[PDB]
Design a protein around this ligand. Structure first.
Ligand SMILES: Nc1ncnc2c1ncn2[C@@H]1O[C@H](COP(=O)(O)OP(=O)(O)O)[C@@H](O)[C@H]1O
Ligand SMILES: Nc1ncnc2c1ncn2[C@@H]1O[C@H](COP(=O)(O)OP(=O)(O)O)[C@@H](O)[C@H]1O
Ligand SMILES: Nc1ncnc2c1ncn2[C@@H]1O[C@H](COP(=O)(O)OP(=O)(O)O)[C@@H](O)[C@H]1O
Ligand SMILES: Nc1ncnc2c1ncn2[C@@H]1O[C@H](COP(=O)(O)OP(=O)(O)O)[C@@H](O)[C@H]1O
Ligand SMILES: Nc1ncnc2c1ncn2[C@@H]1O[C@H](COP(=O)(O)OP(=O)(O)O)[C@@H](O)[C@H]1O
Ligand SMILES: CC(=O)N[C@@H](CCC(=O)O)C(=O)O
Ligand SMILES: CC(=O)N[C@@H](CCC(=O)O)C(=O)O
Ligand SMILES: CC(=O)N[C@@H](CCC(=O)O)C(=O)O
Ligand SMILES: CC(=O)N[C@@H](CCC(=O)O)C(=O)O
Ligand SMILES: CC(=O)N[C@@H](CCC(=O)O)C(=O)O
Ligand SMILES: [Cl-]
Ligand SMILES: [Cl-]
Ligand SMILES: [Cl-]
Ligand SMILES: [Mg+2]
Ligand SMILES: [Mg+2]
Ligand SMILES: [Mg+2]
Ligand SMILES: [Mg+2]
Lengths: 296, 292, 298, 287, 291, 294
C-alpha cells in the first residue's frame, strides 16, 4: 500500500540501479545462505524478499542453503553430540537422519515458504529429488609424520553430478529452486555435503553469471582481520597452509575458485547477516567482501 | 542377465498387457500410498516397481502418501505426547512442527529415493511447495472441538503438477498444507489424494488400505459400485464408521471429476499393477463408468 | 550510490509494491511521450531508462512519441513557405515531407537510441512501415457561430487513423522489442498524414487491447478550474466539464482519447505530468494515480 | 488371474528387464524383417504386435521389409522367371515394375495394416516418397544385374518427422536416382543405410536362420571385417547372407552402435534381443 | 525464357495475380486428379508442376488421384477381367487385390514421383496408412433389391491428424482412394468421394474436381457457376445432370455443406487448368459455394 | 481486377519459371538497390514490384540502399558544403545529422512505401534500430609515409543483429536497411551501402548478394563483361588498373561476402527494368557472378 513520496524513491532507485541489474537480467544466479547467517527471522524473511525482488527484476535465482541453528537444536534434544573437522561435521548414522530431516523437511521448506509469502514461487528440493545431486562418498585426509592419513568422518560425500534438466525446467517455469545439501549415491544411500560445495557444483553445472556465498563475516580474512579480495589459487593454498583459512572457510574458497574456473563469471563471499546483503550486492557494486573473478 | 526363456516370459506378458497399457496411456492415476501395512518392507519395493513401470508404459502416476511410524517415533524421542480422535491427530504448534519435518523430510523423500532406486525420477513435494496444497482450518464438530492445526484442502496448484508430469517426473506429495497466512496444516492423506485427484480430473484415484475392500453382510467384496449405489449403501448402513471417511472421500472424487475410484487391499503384492494390468478391479471400485 | 539506509527503503517498498508491479507482467502499456517541455535531453533519457526498467520487470511497453521544435527549426532553415488558416499551419506537401523526415528520421530514432543506450531493444517505425498506421484526410471546418453554415478549410496533410497493423506490433513485442512509433499515417494512395500523437497512441492501445494507455502531458493531471487534479471520471463528468469550460484547448482530444480508448478495450488510461522524473514508473507502483485516471468500471 | 505366485515373478522380472529396455528408449531401432522369416500371417502378425509393444514402451522403430512369397507368385503368374546372384535378384523392366508394384502396394501396405490393427500407426513408404531412398546403379560383376542399385542417401528428415509425430515408418526397399528411375535394392542394404543415416542404436536383421553360421552349422558372433572376408572367399558365407553381414559391418563401421542377425521365425524374436542381452545370433559391435 | 519485354509484362500480370494468390496463401486445396484423357503423359507432368507451383506460392495442395487404365491392363495380363457399370466397380476379392496394388503401388507412387522431380516432396498414401481413410461396405440398390457391391465403400473417417502433420512439414499428400475396414479389409472407392471427404475433414478452402468436360453445363451447353447448394439441388430435378457427373456434383454439395468453402468442377485437359482457378477471382469453370 | 486469357499466361510463365524459382525458395537474397541513378519511377516501381514477386514466390528478399543524391540536395539547401575523399563522404557532425535524417527518414521509408504500394510488407530500419548495424570509426590515410586523414563520422561494420532480421523475414516482412551504423557510445556512422549490404548477407549466410550498379557488370579495359571470377583473378584485375573507382569497393565487398559465407554475389546493371527478376526467373550470363569455389 504505497504513497507518492514512496514511489518517488522506489523508482529513483530501481531506475538508478538498472545498469547493475542489467548485468544479470536473464542470466542465472545461485545464492548460498544459511549456516550462521541465518540466526534471526527478520533476516530469514528479509533474504526471502531479496530473492523474490531479484526474480521480479529479471534475474533467475537458485537458492542453496545450509541449516545451522536448527540442525543443532534438534541434535541437542536428541542427545546426539556434534563435531566438525575442517568445515565438515562428523556424520554418523543417527546424525545423518537428523540432518537429512531437518535440512530438507524443516529449514528447506521454511525458506520456500518465506519466498512464497513475498510473492515468489519456490520449490523445496534436495539431492534425492530426481537424483538432483548424485554423490560418491568423500575421501577425507590429514598429515608431519608423512604419507596421507585417511580419515573417516562418516556419511559425508562429494558431488559427482547435478540434474540441470530438472533445475532448468523449474527455472523456465518461473520457479525459484531452493536446494538442501543432501546427496544420493549409486546405492540410494544418503550423503551430508557442505552447502557451500553444493552451491558451487550447482552453479558450475548451471553456468550462472555469479555465485553468492552469504556468511557469518565481512568476508575471508588474513589472521590480522583484513578482508582479502581478488585471490588466485596460489595465494589461497599458501594461506590455508599458513593456518589462515580454516574451519568452514575451507570449503568456502574451495567453492569459489572452482565455481569460477568451472564457468562462473564471479563468486562473492559476503556477510549475510547484513540487512539486504543480497539486494545490495546486485543493485550496487560495493567493494565489500572477498570477490573472486576471472571475468574477461 | 535374463536367461532366454526368461525374456520370452517377460514378453508374452507385455504382449498380453498391450490392450490395458493402451487403455490408460497418457492418463493421471493418483495413488494414495500408505497402508499401516503396505509401507512395511516387501511391499515397499513392489510399489516402486509398480509406479515406475506404469510410467515407462507412458502412464501418469501421482503418489500421495501418509506418515505413521516415522512420525510416531520422533515424537516419542522428543518425548512429545499426542493423542488422536477422529482418525486425526490433535495437533498443537509443537507437534505440527515435528509432523511437518518428518513427513516432508523423512517419509516423503524416502518414498522418492525408493521409487528412484527402481529406475524412477521422483520429485517429493509438500503443500508448501509453490503453495501446491492450499488449505484452511478444518471444522471438527463432535456431537465444536478444536483438533489443533488440522485443515482441509481449499485448492491445488494443478499448474505445477501438470508441469512435472509433462516433464515426465513422478510427483510424491506429502499431506501438509498452507493457509492464507502461510500457516501449516496437517491434513489426512486420503482427502488430499482425493482432492489432488479432483483437481487433475485423474482417470483413477487409488486408495490403498489394509482391507480386502468393502463387503456386505456375507463377507463378499462389493465391487462394481456407482455414486448413488454407494449413497444408498450407506443410508441403509452396510458401511461402518472407519470405512465411511474413505468412502465419503472416494465419493467426492467421482462427484468431482474422477471416473473410476479404487479402494484397494494394499497388502497384496503388486496390487496397483493388478488393479490396472488386469481389468478385474478386485477390491471396491466406485464410478459411473458404462460397461457393456 | 545506494546506502544501507536507502536500500532498507527499496526493500520494504518494492515488496509491498511487488503485487502492483506483477499485475502488469503480461500485457502491453502504450505510452505517449513526446511534448514540448519533455523534449529536453534530461527528461528523455530518464524516460528511455524508465521504459527499459518496465521491460526488465516483465512489462511490454509500446511508445508513441510526438513533439519537437526541431520540426520548425528545419522548416525555417529550409525557407519552406509558411501558411496559416484559422491559426493553424497548413501542412502542405513540402511541409509534410519535412515533418515526416524529422519525426521519422531524427526524433523517432533518437528515442530509439536512448532506449538502446540503457539496455532495451527499440525499433523505430512510422505509419509507413508495413502500413503500421493507415489513415485518411481529416475534415476540418473553420470556427464559426452556432447559427452559421460551417466552412471546410483545407489545412493540408492532417489525418485520422483508420487502422493499425497489430500483427507487426505483436510480432515485435513477442520478440522482446520495444516499438517506438512516429505519429505519421499512410493513406490508400500512399500519401502521408500528420496525426495528433495522442490519438495515434490511443488507436494503438485499442488495437492491442492494451492494459494501460498513458498520455504524458505537461500539466500534472487534468485540473478542475480551480487547480485540482481530477480522477476516475466517467463520460458524463467529462461531458459537463467541457460543457462549462474547464476542459479546453488540447486537453480536449486527450480525454476524448482516454474515453474512446477505454470504451474500446484499454483497461485504464492515465493522463499524467511527463515532466515529473520517473513519471511513468509512478503510475505502476501504486494504484494511487498521481493525475487523471480514466477507467470505465474498475 | 495374473494370480498370486505368478505376479511376484512378473514383477521382479519386468523390473530387471527395465534397464535393458532403457538403453534404447530415446534412440532409434531399425527392424529388417521380411525375407523368408515372413512366411506365415499368424507369425507375421505377432511381429507387428511385437512392434507396437516397443512403441508403447517408448522405443522408436523403423521397419524395413522384403519379399519372398508375394514377389514369387506374381512373377510366376505373369511368365517372368526370376534369377539370383549373391543375394540379389537380377531385375529387368517388367521385373522391376512388378517388384516396385508388389513390394510397394501389396507387401508394404499390408504390414502397415497389421501394425495398425494392433494399435500403433504406420505409414507405408518407398524410396520414392519424397525421394526417401536415393540411388545409383550398383557397380558389380560386368554383370548386367539390371536395375539393382545402391543407396546414395536417405531422406532422414522425412523419417525424423514421422517418428516424432508418433508414427511407424514401414519402408519397402525401392530406390530412386537422379532421373527418377526405380532401382530394386536388397531390403538388407537399405536397412543398413537407413540405420547409418539415422544413427540408430541398433540394426535388427530378422532372418530365416538363427545367426550366420560356419560350414559346421556353428553360429558366430563378434566377427570383424578381416575374418568375415575370409568367410566369403571360402564358400562359408553365401547367397542371402552375403548382403546380410556386409550391411551389418557397414552399419557399425558407419554409425550404428550394433547390428544383430537373429531368427525371425522365433515368436517374439525382436523383443528377446531387447529385453535381454541373449548372446545368441550374430552380433556385430565395435571392440 | 521471359526475355526482355515479357519480363516487363510478367511483372505487371504477376502483381495483378498476387492478390488473387493471397486469398489462398496458407489455405488447403484438396484436388481430385485421376481420369481418362488426363492419362496423357505430357499432360500429367503439367499437373505435377502446377501443384509444386501452388506449394511455392504459399498454398498447401492435397492430392487425391483415381484412374485405372493401369489396372485393367494388369487384370488382363493375369486374365482376370470383369464388368462393373453403375458408377462403382463391382470388386471380387481378386480384382480388389489388384485394384489396391496398382492404385497404391504404381499409379499413386508415380504421381508422387513426378511432383518430386519438379521440386516437391510428395508422400504416397492409401487408406491403409495410419488408417487414413476408414471405411465399410456399401448399399447399392437396383433402380429395391441390393446389388452386391462390397469390396467398395462409403468413407466413414479420415485421419486429419496425419494430413496435418504432412502439410505442416511442407509435404504434398498424394492419396490413392482405398478404404480400410474396422476389421482391415480394403474397399475400393470413387476418387471424387474420397477427395471431398478429405476436403470436409480438413475444412479446406477448395475442393477441385478435375473432369474431362468444361464444368457443369446446362440445356444449351453453356457453362454454369457461382450458384448455390439449394440452387444445385434444383437442377438435379431439372434432371439436367447425368452419368458420372451426378455424384461429382453430390460430392461437392456435401463438401460445401460439409464446411469446405468452395468446390470447383473443372476441365482437367486445359493445361495449368487448376492454376486458372486460383489466379482468376471468378472461377474459370463451374463453381459451387454457398457462403 | 482480373484478366482471363492472360491468367493462362501467368500460368505458362511461372510454370516455366519453376526450375529457377525452385533454386531459391526459402533462401534469403540481400539486394542492394542502385542504378536508381536518374531517379526514374517506372524503375523504382519496377524494383519494388520485383522484390514483392520474389516474396510471393517464396524467396526472402532483404534490401539495402544508399542515397547520395538525396543527401546532396538537402545539404545544398542548408548551405553545407559537401566533400568526398576516396569515395567515402567527409562527414562532420552537421553533415552526419543530415545524412542520417535523409537516409533513414526519407529515402528509406520511401522505398518501404513503394514496396508496400505493390503488395509487400516492408520495414524500414537503420543501424540504430535494435543496434541492427554495429560500427566503429573507419581509419583512412593517404600517400600525398601514409598520413592519417580524418574524414569524419564514417565507420566500418563490426557486427549485425541477425536476430532482428531473422525474426522479420520469418514474419513475412521485407527488411529495408539504411546504411547508418551505431558505435559503442551511441554515435552514428555513415557507411558505404555496398559494404553494409555485404556484411548483412555474410551475417545471414545469404544465398545471394545482389549489387545493382549503373553499368553492366565488372568490365575489361575493352568493355567486355567479366563473370564467375576467382579471388586470384580479381587481384590481377585490380593490379593492372582494370578495376578502379567505385567498382573497387564493390568487388572487394563481393569477394569478402563469398569468403564469408554468401554462396554467390553478383554485380548487376540496375538500370535495366526488372534487372532483379531476370537474374532469378531466368539465368543469363548478364552481370558479374562472383563465386569462389562454389
Ligand atoms: N580466513 C578466514 N576468514 C574469515 N572467516 C574464517 C577464516 N578462517 C576461518 N573462518 C571461519 O569461517 C566462519 C564462517 O564459516 P562457517 O562457520 O562454515 O559458516 P557458514 O558456511 O554456515 O556461513 C567464520 O565464523 C570463521 O570462524
Ligand atoms: N481541464 C484542463 N486540465 C488540464 N489542462 C487543461 C485543461 N483544459 C485545457 N488544458 C490545456 O491542455 C494543455 C496540455 O496539452 P496540449 O494542449 O496537448 O499541449 P502539450 O503539447 O504541451 O501537451 C495544458 O497546457 C492546458 O493549457
Ligand atoms: N554362412 C551362412 N550362415 C547362415 N545362413 C546362411 C549362410 N550363407 C547363407 N545362408 C542363407 O541365408 C539365408 C537368409 O538370407 P536370405 O536368403 O537372403 O533371406 P532373408 O532375406 O529372409 O534374410 C538363410 O535362410 C540361409 O539359407
Ligand atoms: N449437366 C451436365 N453438364 C456437364 N457434363 C455432364 C452433365 N451431365 C452429364 N455430364 C457428363 O459427365 C461427364 C463427366 O463424368 P464421367 O463421364 O463419369 O467421367 P470422369 O468421372 O472420368 O470425369 C462429362 O464429360 C459429361 O459428358
Ligand atoms: N572495371 C570496371 N568495371 C565496371 N565499372 C568500373 C570499372 N572501373 C571503374 N568502374 C566505375 O565504377 C562505377 C560503379 O561504381 P560507383 O561509381 O560507386 O556507382 P554505383 O555503385 O552508385 O552504381 C562504374 O559506373 C564505373 O564508372
Ligand atoms: C557435510 C557437511 O558438513 N555438511 C553441512 C551441511 C549444512 C551446511 O553447509 O550448513 C553440515 O552442517 O552438516
Ligand atoms: C491430521 C492427521 O491425522 N494427520 C496424519 C497424516 C499422515 C497420514 O494420513 O498418515 C497424521 O499421522 O499425522
Ligand atoms: C535386389 C534384391 O535382391 N532385392 C530383394 C528385395 C526383398 C528382400 O531383401 O527380401 C529381392 O528379393 O527382390
Ligand atoms: C468403386 C470405384 O469407383 N472404383 C474406382 C476407383 C478408381 C477411381 O475412382 O479412379 C475404380 O476404378 O475401381
Ligand atoms: C560515408 C559514405 O559513403 N557515405 C554515403 C552514404 C550513401 C550511400 O552509400 O549511398 C554518403 O553519401 O553520405
Ligand atoms: Cl578470524
Ligand atoms: Cl488551467
Ligand atoms: Cl570503365
Ligand atoms: Mg559452513
Ligand atoms: Mg498539444
Ligand atoms: Mg535377402
Ligand atoms: Mg555509388
Amino acid at each position: 500500500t504505497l504513497s507518492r513520496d514512496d514511489a518517488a524513491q522506489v523508482a529513483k532507485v530501481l531506475s538508478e540501479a538498472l545498469p547493475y541489474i542489467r548485468r544479470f537480467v536473464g542470466k542465472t544466479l545461485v545464492i548460498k545462505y544459511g549456516g550462521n547467517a541465518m540466526e534471526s527471522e527478520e533476516l530469514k524473511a528479509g533474504f526471502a524478499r531479496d530473492v523474490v525482488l531479484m526474480k521480479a527484476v529479471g534475474i533467475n535465482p537458485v537458492v542453496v542453503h545450509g541449516g545451522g541453528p536448527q540442525i543443532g537444536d534438534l541434535l541437542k534434544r536428541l542427545s546426539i553430540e556434534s563435531h566438525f573437522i575442517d568445515g565438515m561435521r562428523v556424520t554418523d548414522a543417527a546424525t545423518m537422519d537428523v540432518v537429512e530431516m531437518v535440512l530438507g523437511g524443516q529449514v528447506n521448506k521454511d525458506i520456500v515458504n518465506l519466498i512464497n509469502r513475498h510473492g515468489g514461487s519456490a520449490i523445496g528440493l534436495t539431492g534425492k529429488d530426481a537424483e538432483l545431486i548424485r554423490a560418491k562418498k568423500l575421501t577425507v585426509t590429514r598429515q608431519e609424520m608423512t604419507k596421507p592419513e585417511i580419515i573417516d568422518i562418516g556419511h559425508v560425500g562429494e558431488v559427482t553430478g547435478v540434474n540441470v534438466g530438472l533445475l532448468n525446467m523449474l527455472v523456465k517455469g518461473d520457479f525459484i529452486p531452493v536446494i538442501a545439501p543432501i546427496g544420493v549415491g549409486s546405492n540410494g544411500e544418503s550423503y551430508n555435503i557442505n552447502a557451500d560445495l553444493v552451491a558451487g557444483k550447482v552453479a558450475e553445472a548451471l553456468k550462472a553469471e555469479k555465485l553468492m556465498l552469504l556468511t557469518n563475516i565481512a568476508g575471508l580474512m588474513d589472521k590480522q582481520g583484513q578482508v582479502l579480495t581478488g585471490l588466485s589459487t596460489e595465494q589461497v593454498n599458501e594461506l590455508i597452509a599458513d593456518g589462515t583459512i580454516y574451519g568452514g572457510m575451507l570449503p568456502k574458497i574451495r567453492c569459489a575458485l572452482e565455481a569460477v574456473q568451472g564457468g562462473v563469471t564471479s563468486a562473492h563471499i559476503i556477510d549475510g547477516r547484513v540487512p539486504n546483503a543480497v539486494l545490495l550486492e546486485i543493485f550496487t557494486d560495493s567493494g565489500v567482501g572477498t570477490l573472486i573473478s576471472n571475468r574477461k
